[PDB]
RNA sequence: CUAAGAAAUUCACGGCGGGCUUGAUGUCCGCGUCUACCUGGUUCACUGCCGUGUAGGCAG
């Protein structure tokens, strides 16, 4: 999203910490609204916003700058495959690599 | 029907200042190298003559 949206994403990630409010932003009414200090209708509208932000909310489409390669079928036509950059996977491999390269274990 | 398909890096520049590397030294004892072979495989594509001839042959 936009970087101003990433500010609200950091706020939501900070709200997830400490209590069980990361899974309890949606699944709670009294403990959520009493801490939020809003009306019950406003609390329901706020819970719907977090439920929508957790969901995808994207129409299925690709772009012209993406890859969309052809794979051949066994004795048949072809299929289009649009490969997506795995971001969580490289973040995990990057965490493992920066752990292996530097730590008190690695430096020791 | 290829993580497909596309692309201008680039302009300019002072690295130089100077210097003692020295003294000293035991390489050394000992040793069985042997046995057996066809340089020819056409291996010297030569030398001279008749013929104007490079054309063609001759003689050793």
mmCIF file of C-alpha atoms (C1' of nucleotides) in Angstrom:
data_model
loop_
_atom_site.group_PDB
_atom_site.id
_atom_site.type_symbol
_atom_site.label_atom_id
_atom_site.label_comp_id
_atom_site.label_asym_id
_atom_site.label_seq_id
_atom_site.Cartn_x
_atom_site.Cartn_y
_atom_site.Cartn_z
ATOM 1 C CA UNK A 1 0.000 0.000 0.000
ATOM 2 C CA UNK A 2 0.889 3.652 0.336
ATOM 3 C CA UNK A 3 3.428 4.699 2.966
ATOM 4 C CA UNK A 4 0.788 6.582 4.959
ATOM 5 C CA UNK A 5 -1.075 3.273 5.055
ATOM 6 C CA UNK A 6 2.135 1.651 6.326
ATOM 7 C CA UNK A 7 1.986 4.042 9.285
ATOM 8 C CA UNK A 8 -1.424 2.593 10.198
ATOM 9 C CA UNK A 9 -0.032 -0.893 9.554
ATOM 10 C CA UNK A 10 2.717 -0.214 12.101
ATOM 11 C CA UNK A 11 0.060 1.046 14.529
ATOM 12 C CA UNK A 12 -1.969 -2.151 14.060
ATOM 13 C CA UNK A 13 1.157 -4.284 14.519
ATOM 14 C CA UNK A 14 1.895 -2.420 17.755
ATOM 15 C CA UNK A 15 -1.711 -3.017 18.834
ATOM 16 C CA UNK A 16 -1.279 -6.754 18.217
ATOM 17 C CA UNK A 17 1.516 -6.965 20.800
ATOM 18 C CA UNK A 18 1.139 -7.425 24.552
ATOM 19 C CA UNK A 19 -2.417 -8.657 24.985
ATOM 20 C CA UNK A 20 -4.383 -11.059 22.790
ATOM 21 C CA UNK A 21 -5.658 -8.074 20.785
ATOM 22 C CA UNK A 22 -3.964 -9.225 17.565
ATOM 23 C CA UNK A 23 -6.589 -11.943 17.179
ATOM 24 C CA UNK A 24 -8.946 -9.996 19.457
ATOM 25 C CA UNK A 25 -9.292 -6.879 17.304
ATOM 26 C CA UNK A 26 -12.105 -8.707 15.502
ATOM 27 C CA UNK A 27 -13.232 -11.280 18.078
ATOM 28 C CA UNK A 28 -14.249 -9.013 20.936
ATOM 29 C CA UNK A 29 -16.960 -6.470 21.654
ATOM 30 C CA UNK A 30 -16.892 -5.261 25.267
ATOM 31 C CA UNK A 31 -13.134 -5.509 25.873
ATOM 32 C CA UNK A 32 -12.507 -3.943 22.462
ATOM 33 C CA UNK A 33 -14.962 -1.034 22.662
ATOM 34 C CA UNK A 34 -14.312 -0.217 26.332
ATOM 35 C CA UNK A 35 -10.621 0.225 25.555
ATOM 36 C CA UNK A 36 -11.313 1.955 22.225
ATOM 37 C CA UNK A 37 -13.777 4.341 23.924
ATOM 38 C CA UNK A 38 -16.095 4.456 20.893
ATOM 39 C CA UNK A 39 -19.771 3.647 20.408
ATOM 40 C CA UNK A 40 -20.855 0.041 19.835
ATOM 41 C CA UNK A 41 -21.839 0.860 16.250
ATOM 42 C CA UNK A 42 -18.506 2.658 15.833
ATOM 43 C CA UNK A 43 -16.775 -0.342 17.432
ATOM 44 C CA UNK A 44 -18.474 -2.664 14.930
ATOM 45 C CA UNK A 45 -17.412 -0.376 12.072
ATOM 46 C CA UNK A 46 -13.851 -0.386 13.438
ATOM 47 C CA UNK A 47 -13.816 -4.192 13.673
ATOM 48 C CA UNK A 48 -15.106 -4.407 10.092
ATOM 49 C CA UNK A 49 -12.189 -2.222 8.955
ATOM 50 C CA UNK A 50 -9.627 -4.581 10.504
ATOM 51 C CA UNK A 51 -11.474 -7.589 9.064
ATOM 52 C CA UNK A 52 -11.325 -5.967 5.629
ATOM 53 C CA UNK A 53 -7.653 -5.023 5.955
ATOM 54 C CA UNK A 54 -6.839 -8.625 6.884
ATOM 55 C CA UNK A 55 -8.713 -9.806 3.790
ATOM 56 C CA UNK A 56 -7.361 -9.428 0.266
ATOM 57 C CA UNK A 57 -9.858 -7.078 -1.412
ATOM 58 C CA UNK A 58 -8.394 -7.404 -4.894
ATOM 59 C CA UNK A 59 -9.991 -8.205 -8.236
ATOM 60 C CA UNK A 60 -8.168 -11.081 -9.990
ATOM 61 C CA UNK A 61 -5.880 -9.543 -12.603
ATOM 62 C CA UNK A 62 -2.252 -9.263 -13.673
ATOM 63 C CA UNK A 63 -0.207 -6.552 -15.373
ATOM 64 C CA UNK A 64 1.534 -6.123 -18.720
ATOM 65 C CA UNK A 65 4.913 -5.795 -16.982
ATOM 66 C CA UNK A 66 4.601 -9.192 -15.293
ATOM 67 C CA UNK A 67 6.045 -12.383 -16.744
ATOM 68 C CA UNK A 68 3.126 -14.746 -17.617
ATOM 69 C CA UNK A 69 5.128 -17.536 -19.247
ATOM 70 C CA UNK A 70 3.900 -20.534 -21.248
ATOM 71 C CA UNK A 71 4.229 -24.062 -19.929
ATOM 72 C CA UNK A 72 3.597 -26.884 -22.427
ATOM 73 C CA UNK A 73 1.150 -29.661 -21.612
ATOM 74 C CA UNK A 74 1.748 -33.376 -22.258
ATOM 75 C CA UNK A 75 0.528 -33.845 -25.826
ATOM 76 C CA UNK A 76 -1.754 -30.822 -25.617
ATOM 77 C CA UNK A 77 -1.742 -27.031 -25.664
ATOM 78 C CA UNK A 78 -0.133 -24.579 -23.257
ATOM 79 C CA UNK A 79 -0.893 -22.874 -19.947
ATOM 80 C CA UNK A 80 -0.074 -19.377 -18.748
ATOM 81 C CA UNK A 81 1.847 -19.176 -15.484
ATOM 82 C CA UNK A 82 2.273 -15.793 -13.833
ATOM 83 C CA UNK A 83 5.034 -16.094 -11.226
ATOM 84 C CA UNK A 84 4.814 -13.878 -8.174
ATOM 85 C CA UNK A 85 7.766 -12.753 -6.091
ATOM 86 C CA UNK A 86 7.707 -14.709 -2.814
ATOM 87 C CA UNK A 87 8.290 -12.022 -0.181
ATOM 88 C CA UNK A 88 7.829 -13.888 3.100
ATOM 89 C CA UNK A 89 10.060 -16.670 1.810
ATOM 90 C CA UNK A 90 12.987 -14.370 1.013
ATOM 91 C CA UNK A 91 12.419 -12.569 4.304
ATOM 92 C CA UNK A 92 12.788 -15.900 6.104
ATOM 93 C CA UNK A 93 15.861 -16.873 4.051
ATOM 94 C CA UNK A 94 17.226 -13.370 4.700
ATOM 95 C CA UNK A 95 16.692 -13.784 8.437
ATOM 96 C CA UNK A 96 18.555 -17.105 8.337
ATOM 97 C CA UNK A 97 21.390 -15.644 6.254
ATOM 98 C CA UNK A 98 21.859 -12.570 8.444
ATOM 99 C CA UNK A 99 21.764 -14.844 11.478
ATOM 100 C CA UNK A 100 24.452 -17.085 9.989
ATOM 101 C CA UNK A 101 26.620 -14.139 8.945
ATOM 102 C CA UNK A 102 26.448 -12.101 12.165
ATOM 103 C CA UNK A 103 25.545 -12.985 15.732
ATOM 104 C CA UNK A 104 27.440 -13.487 18.943
ATOM 105 C CA UNK A 105 27.490 -17.162 17.941
ATOM 106 C CA UNK A 106 28.850 -16.409 14.459
ATOM 107 C CA UNK A 107 31.356 -13.802 15.648
ATOM 108 C CA UNK A 108 32.430 -16.064 18.509
ATOM 109 C "C1'" C B 1 6.748 -20.143 -27.223
ATOM 110 C "C1'" U B 2 12.516 -19.280 -22.824
ATOM 111 C "C1'" A B 3 11.061 -14.835 -14.431
ATOM 112 C "C1'" A B 4 9.555 -13.894 -22.367
ATOM 113 C "C1'" G B 5 9.138 -9.158 -24.647
ATOM 114 C "C1'" A B 6 12.663 -2.974 -23.882
ATOM 115 C "C1'" A B 7 16.889 0.075 -22.691
ATOM 116 C "C1'" A B 8 23.591 5.422 -24.077
ATOM 117 C "C1'" U B 9 26.760 6.051 -17.854
ATOM 118 C "C1'" U B 10 29.511 10.561 -18.218
ATOM 119 C "C1'" C B 11 32.051 14.894 -18.300
ATOM 120 C "C1'" A B 12 37.196 16.727 -15.609
ATOM 121 C "C1'" C B 13 41.664 15.859 -12.652
ATOM 122 C "C1'" G B 14 49.838 16.988 -10.461
ATOM 123 C "C1'" G B 15 50.418 11.611 -5.263
ATOM 124 C "C1'" C B 16 55.687 13.855 -3.928
ATOM 125 C "C1'" G B 17 58.630 15.178 -0.246
ATOM 126 C "C1'" G B 18 63.015 12.349 2.892
ATOM 127 C "C1'" G B 19 65.894 8.218 4.550
ATOM 128 C "C1'" C B 20 72.897 3.658 6.328
ATOM 129 C "C1'" U B 21 69.278 -2.522 7.446
ATOM 130 C "C1'" U B 22 73.374 -4.257 10.188
ATOM 131 C "C1'" G B 23 76.949 -7.263 12.694
ATOM 132 C "C1'" A B 24 78.522 -13.448 13.466
ATOM 133 C "C1'" U B 25 78.739 -18.471 11.401
ATOM 134 C "C1'" G B 26 82.245 -26.030 9.839
ATOM 135 C "C1'" U B 27 76.989 -28.929 5.955
ATOM 136 C "C1'" C B 28 78.515 -34.055 6.744
ATOM 137 C "C1'" C B 29 79.406 -38.957 7.382
ATOM 138 C "C1'" G B 30 78.182 -43.714 3.578
ATOM 139 C "C1'" C B 31 76.938 -46.081 -1.086
ATOM 140 C "C1'" G B 32 77.613 -51.934 -7.247
ATOM 141 C "C1'" U B 33 72.823 -48.573 -11.324
ATOM 142 C "C1'" C B 34 72.459 -53.604 -14.248
ATOM 143 C "C1'" U B 35 70.883 -57.224 -18.033
ATOM 144 C "C1'" A B 36 69.545 -57.553 -24.259
ATOM 145 C "C1'" C B 37 69.146 -55.517 -28.841
ATOM 146 C "C1'" C B 38 69.758 -55.808 -37.432
ATOM 147 C "C1'" U B 39 68.468 -48.595 -38.750
ATOM 148 C "C1'" G B 40 66.507 -49.648 -42.375
ATOM 149 C "C1'" G B 41 61.417 -49.450 -43.670
ATOM 150 C "C1'" U B 42 62.902 -50.005 -51.966
ATOM 151 C "C1'" U B 43 64.446 -44.239 -47.660
ATOM 152 C "C1'" C B 44 70.372 -41.756 -52.649
ATOM 153 C "C1'" A B 45 63.248 -39.501 -56.575
ATOM 154 C "C1'" C B 46 70.529 -39.107 -58.828
ATOM 155 C "C1'" U B 47 73.965 -38.024 -62.904
ATOM 156 C "C1'" G B 48 74.596 -37.032 -68.025
ATOM 157 C "C1'" C B 49 72.739 -37.298 -73.394
ATOM 158 C "C1'" C B 50 69.329 -36.700 -78.023
ATOM 159 C "C1'" G B 51 65.767 -33.224 -78.842
ATOM 160 C "C1'" U B 52 64.855 -25.280 -80.161
ATOM 161 C "C1'" G B 53 61.563 -27.048 -76.497
ATOM 162 C "C1'" U B 54 59.664 -26.914 -70.077
ATOM 163 C "C1'" A B 55 56.686 -31.766 -75.383
ATOM 164 C "C1'" G B 56 58.844 -36.802 -75.301
ATOM 165 C "C1'" G B 57 62.465 -40.426 -74.442
ATOM 166 C "C1'" C B 58 67.358 -42.370 -73.597
ATOM 167 C "C1'" A B 59 72.275 -44.213 -70.849
ATOM 168 C "C1'" G B 60 74.143 -46.046 -65.878
#
